[PDB]
Ligand binder design. Structure first.
Ligand code: NA
Ligand code: NA
Length: 59
């Protein structure tokens, strides 16, 4: 499915900033300067998540 380009999925659990669970869909709204941190929105709120822990859904 073509998804929002800022729709990401968590690759790993990440615990706080936003806590995410592997497989969780997140909406990335923003990056820090180098994009290693994402201001992301999930079903649980917004906060920073590391890019290293997430990946865009689209391919
Ligand atoms: Na991806
Ligand atoms: Na794909």
């Amino acid at each position: 499915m073509e998804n929002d380009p800022n729709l990401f999925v968590a690759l790993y659990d990440f615990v706080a900033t936003l806590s995410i669970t592997k497989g969780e869909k997140l909406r990335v709204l923003g990056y820090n300067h180098n994009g290693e941190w994402c201001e992301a929105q999930t079903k649980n709120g917004q906060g920073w998540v590391p890019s290293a822990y997430i990946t865009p859904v689209n391919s």
